[PDB]
Amino acid sequence: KLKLDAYHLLEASQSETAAKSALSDLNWFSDLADIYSGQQTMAEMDVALKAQGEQKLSYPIQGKNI
């Protein structure tokens, strides 16, 4: 096993298409993107619940306010 690890590292050094990392295929960047977009949207729409209390309004209307 030890010899094979050495040999693999050596042939990777000799080859040009060798992987830039010893890690296996990574497949958890999609979930990170999805949760980022989710938190972004959840904040954006937990804002306007507070920012649209809308106590009262003052519309200028012809005949009354003028």
Next chain:
Amino acid sequence: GKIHGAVWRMKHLFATNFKMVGHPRYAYALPKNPLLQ
């Protein structure tokens, strides 16, 4: 004596290569490198 000479050369030429884990004619049976792709 022939066998002695053969092994005495095998030592020097195989034991410090890092490329000959076995003989190249049987490299099909080895596992595959995870780093190649």
